[PDB]
Design a protein around this ligand. Structure first.
Ligand SMILES: [Zn+2]
Ligand SMILES: [Zn+2]
Lengths: 128, 128
């Protein structure tokens, strides 16, 4: 058994794809449409779905906003360069909610940002 | 870069821990408590944090209820037998919302369930 993906509903498919890929470094793995039910999906990740967990973005035709709620927390992603990522995010449609810097009571550099739909993203500058 | 984890706030830490480990077959990877911010965490997954994406269960002291909202979708997990998992889940603190069965215009077997806090979980099955 394995963790496959986390699904998030977004207000604008392409805008989200653009964000995850161009800003966060992910790749568009596949996309699909469902005419019957009027929704489109996009899977974004850092590697193949067969090997790792990815993100499933759902766009319901004609729906551009949802109620975020208080239950869902965030998704944490490893980051190559936290400071730089924050910059890219700042200038590329996102918000930086916690500037890059050592975590409290630690040395590991972390940051918090928001995607285009306001979803919280935690960035962690991390056998063999 | 990689997907590290998906964080979800839960109303009862042990209740969630029990569900993810005993029912879903995950392992309790680690726990922590933070007196300043008043919360406790539990990381559950199918593999170590260095190898896979996991779930971060967050319990805010004295907070037993949240608003799920309509934005967050779900987490998808692979299972050896969707039907068996559904029955185990329905009898152990969970709820089956979509009985195990093939996807319309498909052969892939899937089911949708809910955890103890109402979080949606998609189960995707991997000559009787
Ligand atoms: Zn986290
Ligand atoms: Zn899904």
């Amino acid at each position: 058994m394995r963790l496959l993906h986390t699904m998030l509903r977004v207000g604008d498919l392409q805008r989200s794809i653009d964000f995850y890929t161009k800003v966060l470094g992910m790749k568009l793995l596949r996309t699909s449409e469902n005419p019957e039910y009027k929704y489109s999906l996009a899977f974004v990740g850092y590697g193949p779905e067969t090997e790792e967990a990815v993100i499933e973005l759902t766009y319901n035709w004609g729906v551009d906003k949802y109620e975020l709620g208080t239950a869902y927390g965030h998704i944490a992603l490893s980051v190559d360069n936290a400071a730089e990522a924050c910059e890219k995010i700042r200038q590329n449609g996102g918000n930086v909610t916690r500037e890059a810097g050592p975590v409290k009571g630690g040395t590991t550099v972390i940051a918090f940002v928001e995607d285009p739909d306001g979803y919280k993203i935690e960035l962690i500058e991390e056998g063999n």
